Design a protein around this nucleic acid. Sequence first.
RNA 1: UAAGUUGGGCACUCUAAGUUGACUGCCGGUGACAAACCGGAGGAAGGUGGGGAUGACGUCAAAUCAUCAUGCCCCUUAUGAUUUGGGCUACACACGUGCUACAAUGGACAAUACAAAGGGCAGCGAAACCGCGAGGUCAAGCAAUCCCAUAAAGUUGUUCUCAGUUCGGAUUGUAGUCUGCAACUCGACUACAUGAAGCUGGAAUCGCUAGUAAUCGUAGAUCAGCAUGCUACGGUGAAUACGU
Lengths: 154, 60, 127, 113, 80
Amino acid sequence: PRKGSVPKRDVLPDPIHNSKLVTKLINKIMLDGKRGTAQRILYSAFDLVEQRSGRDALEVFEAINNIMPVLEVKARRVGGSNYQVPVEVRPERRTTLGLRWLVNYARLRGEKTMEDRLANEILDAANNTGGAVKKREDTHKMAEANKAFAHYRW
Amino acid sequence: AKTSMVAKQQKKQKYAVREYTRCERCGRPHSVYRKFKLCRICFRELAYKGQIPGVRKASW
Amino acid sequence: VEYRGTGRRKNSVARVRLVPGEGNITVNNRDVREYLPFESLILDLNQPFDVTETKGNYDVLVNVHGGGFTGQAQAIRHGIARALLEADPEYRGSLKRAGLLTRDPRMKERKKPGLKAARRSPQFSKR
Amino acid sequence: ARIAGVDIPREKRVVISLTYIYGIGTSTAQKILEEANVSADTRVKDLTDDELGRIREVVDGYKVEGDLRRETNLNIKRLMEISSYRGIRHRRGLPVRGQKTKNNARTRKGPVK
Amino acid sequence: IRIRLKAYDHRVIDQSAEKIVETAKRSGADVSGPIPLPTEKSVYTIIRAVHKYKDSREQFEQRTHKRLIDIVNPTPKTVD
RNA sequence: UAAGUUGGGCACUCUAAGUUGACUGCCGGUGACAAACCGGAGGAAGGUGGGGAUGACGUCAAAUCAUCAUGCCCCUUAUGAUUUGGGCUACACACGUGCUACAAUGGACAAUACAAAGGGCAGCGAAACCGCGAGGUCAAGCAAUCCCAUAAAGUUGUUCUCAGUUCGGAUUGUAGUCUGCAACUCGACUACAUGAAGCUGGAAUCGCUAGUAAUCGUAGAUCAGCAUGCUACGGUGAAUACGU
């Protein structure tokens, strides 16, 4: 509940999910200011996502319940020595960290076309077996499972 | 890069065999003449309309 | 000279780095026809441009700052309009018929405390 | 099948069958078969009925057949014995091209060490 | 003739621009004078051979200072 | 209207080949006894135009007979020297450095539309000779041009398909380039074959701001055998600040 945050001033209206995350993921995986083209590249395999799966793509895009940096170990050298201490993520930071988490930590396993494998890796991703979903348990193993110091906050 | 080629023509440093003597102020280094600092192209333009007694026809 | 252009439209100032000659207008560095949320008149979004007669004679390659959903649109047109004023003095005299300097005499009023929109109020609620 | 008489590799890459066959080291394995729909999904003799026939026609029409290329290569051995090089007096002993007899041992040709 | 005038420095090219107008005035034909030549160059430093702090190659600059004063109708008395 | 424009110095632009306004100085703005510089229309020039350049006297010989002068030194048919038996690279590689292929949110190789810094009387290229390549063209002009332009993105290949597969600019060896005489006992390019380990990584360390750092394009101060490192700016140049 930090009142003081970074000046964001961003917009992301989506008429396919009725929220501000579908366009947030369309602006996170966007390149060379691609907004309208992003939707075309996102709807290019959108039908295949719901065609190569047995669940609803909208709610599948249950695969988003295992890609959040719960408590990542950041850099504060505490007590005059070079040590690492973990920190808590913000609601308006973990959503942007996990949104592009599969667009950088899930580029080692692909097949078929160029946008059909994205949903292929999207399916059966909740169950720890991939690389981008392996960072979720790696985040908690980098701060909680191995006890460390926590007083150095940021 | 004609200005950079008309500048570095007789640069004398550790090796004086690196600078190539060509048209003093004009261009067309090839298809001319170079021995007494006077290229045909430049001399022709420098003798345009009969200037310094140099550009002639024949007359033995 | 057509860079650092001042153009405010309903609280939406935006600088434009237009270059003389090349005409590669790429707002947001890509498509500008499928970016604007609404903007029905996408081709009629530049009214002064027609009189300016420099549609394909300047490359925008700039951005937009602040504004609303459609309030951020039709702001770079005035941004390059002021940039053309410094780029050529003929433009000023060429656009004497229109001459767009200010087009934001009011703001946007919605839900507010005390008064409905701090001006109007409920009157005979229809049953 | 009858590509080499007795298929060495089985149930694997379609171009992996030409890897075990001498004469090609996976450099022209996908540059010899250019027939219509000549794909491969890890199934040499699987999901296929007629495809080797065209591969046996492009391998026979090529300059090198498969045994004649090794025939001339195993016939120039005595043809390169005109007091020149090609291990004239190297293979007989143990020393090989590179003079690695002083740097280490003779890994090329070595009976017992 | 369309020929340039590369002297030494700025005043060296200034005295060569008035001296070429004098020789051209001697001949009986049209003569020019001032010639617009907007300033435009660059500079850079590196190393020399022995020891000489900064600013390698003891020289003035790489300025391409020149001119364009000449004659239009050269006659037999245009040689002087 | 031949990017050697063949014109009309035809009409002037965006223009090159001496600088200029401008920058402190009242400036909109008040310090309280008190200017002002910021920046207001300021001009394109956010204010030394933006800016840089600048090596103040020094300190460490840290470096230098192998950066030389020398307090000066080291060989006197051998440390020279006309130069071969022959050299510091090729063997376990012990590092920094040389790009690299570890992948389908993609490979080598089609035609290919569009600045360059610089290269050149023997040398640059539009379908052509040179479009996998290392090269065997004489050569139009012969250097604002002409050639690289067969460069580049917002506007394109291909194809082999959770991998050894048409993904691997390593070794190795007949052999073509660069040099082949000193490589027999010292380098390489991509190939007729050999084409490794290699699925984001060691001991240990190194790297990140819309015409630029980087990056499609990309560069030498150059030795008769190593260009495979940043190296030039038209445009791909998309992104820019919880905190003192």
